[PDB]
Each structure stands twice: as C-alpha cells, then as structure tokens.
Structure 1
Amino acid sequence: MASGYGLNGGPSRCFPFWQELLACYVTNSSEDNPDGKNKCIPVMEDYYECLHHRKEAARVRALQAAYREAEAKKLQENPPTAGQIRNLGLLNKEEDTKKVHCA
C-alpha cells in the first residue's frame, strides 16, 4: 500500500506504484500548467490495479473460460497422474518426467 511498510518487515508491494504516482505529479503538475497532471492518469490507474486487482481479475476470467473450453473440447490421450506430477524433476524417475512433459 502507500506507506512503504509491509507485513514481513519488508516494503509494501504497492509502494513502487505509489512513489511513481507521487513522482509523476510533482514533476508534471505546476502552477504554470494545470494540465500536466493528466500525464498522471495511467500512473493512477496502475496504483489502483496493484491495490484492488479488478483488471487482472477480468483478464484471468476471460482467459480461464477460453482455456477450459479449449482443453475440454481438445482430444484427450492420457492423463498424467498426481504421482507422476509429484515425480517431476527427481533423481531416479526419468520415465515419469518424460511422460509428464510428453517429450
């Protein structure tokens, strides 16, 4: 968020987006030109996007419906079981990994 202090003692995840919006306003808005702050509009939407996630929620909804409807329609040959997925990148399970990656 806007403060700079997050939950682990490290910095807030939306702080870079807040510092850019403040930087943009201070370095574009002035008394001579009231309309420099219109440059700050995209910077302002991004700070809200890092805060609420409505646009990234909207993209994943579209692609997720598109993705499932494609995999559902798509031809199915052999499902890689959870044990096979659990054996990806192991020391002596080369056969399982090859099946998972279809290579």
Structure 2
Amino acid sequence: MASGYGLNGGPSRCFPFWQELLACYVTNSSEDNPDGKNKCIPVMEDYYECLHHRKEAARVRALQAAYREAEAKKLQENPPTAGQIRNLGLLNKEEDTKKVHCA
C-alpha cells in the first residue's frame, strides 16, 4: 500500500497508485482554486481499487458467470485429458501440443 516497502524487500504494489494521487493533489489543489482537487477523484478511486479489488471482483464475477453459461451451451466433442495439458511445450510431444490447440 501507501508505505512503499513490501513483503519481499521490494516496494509495495499500491505504491505507484498512492504516489500518483499525492502528486495529483499537490499539483492541482491550492488555496487559489479549492476545487482543483476534484481532478483527484478518479486517481483516488484507483488507489482504493488497487487496495481492495471490489471493482475487479465485480468484473470477473459477471464475466465468469457469463463465460461458464456459454461453456455449457457450447458444443462439446472431446475434452483434453489432464496429462495432455501437461504435455504442451515439451521436447518430443508434438502430437499432444497440437491436440491442445485443436490444430
């Protein structure tokens, strides 16, 4: 988040989103123009979105129910086996990789 110091010794994931919001505030707000900080409204929403993921969880949720209902309606002929997915990209398994790609 806003600190800039993450779990691995590298920087926090939502630090770019926070630095952009502070940069926006200092570079738009002032006493001369109080309402310049309305420029920060989308920037402040992105910082919260990076933090809690409510908007992205709502997008995937709608997309995932839409995707699955199309899969059931979709015509099915032959499902790849688990072992066939494992074979994709190997040294001498050209037959399986082709089957995975329907080619």
> Per the shorter chain, which TM-score range?
over 0.9
TM-score, normalization: structure 2? 0.99
Instruction: Report the CA distance between 1:8 and its aligned residue.
Output: 0.1
Q: What is the CA-CA distance between 1:68 and the residue it aligns to?
A: 0.2
Please state how far the C-alpha of 1:12 moved relative to its aligned partner. Answer: 0.1
Gaps of 5+ in 1: none
1:5-84 alignment, distance < 5 Å = 5-84=5-84
Deviation digits for residues 10-59 of structure 1 (CA, Å, limit 9, x no counterpart): 00000000000000000000010000000000000000000000000000
C-alpha distance after superposition, 1:56-83 (max 9, x if no partner)? 0000000000000001110001100000
Compute the TM-score of the two structures, normalised by the length of structure 1. Answer: 0.99
Q: What is the CA-CA distance between 1:85 and the residue it aligns to?
A: 0.1
4+ residue runs of structure 1 moved beyond 2 angstroms? none
- Alpha-carbon distance, 1:101 to partner: 0.7
> Pairwise CA RMSD of aligned residues?
0.3
Pairs aligned (count):
103
**Secondary structure of the corresponding residue to residue 55 of structure 2:** helix
